[PDB]
Structure formats: C-alpha cells, structure tokens
Amino acid sequence: MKFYTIKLPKFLGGIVRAMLGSFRKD
C-alpha cells in the first residue's frame, strides 16, 4: 500500500495501472 516491498522500478506501477485502465469501472 505505502510502497512495494519489491525493489522494482515501476513494474506493477506502470503495469497494474494498465490493468485498471483496462478494467474501467466508470
């Protein structure tokens, strides 16, 4: 939540947004 425990650069950050951007709740 606060930050990813993974030392990733923006893995989920750029990707997970894509997932949501594809979900489009409203």
Side-chain angles (χ1 to χ4, degrees):
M1 186 178 187
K2 186 182 287 191
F3 183 85
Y4 298 105
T5 166
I6 309 98
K7 305 289 184 62
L8 55 67
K10 56 181 180 179
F11 190 95
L12 293 172
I15 297 170
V16 88
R17 290 280 186 191
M19 304 290 173
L20 297 178
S22 301
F23 204 69
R24 315 186 66 180
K25 185 176 179 61
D26 60 353

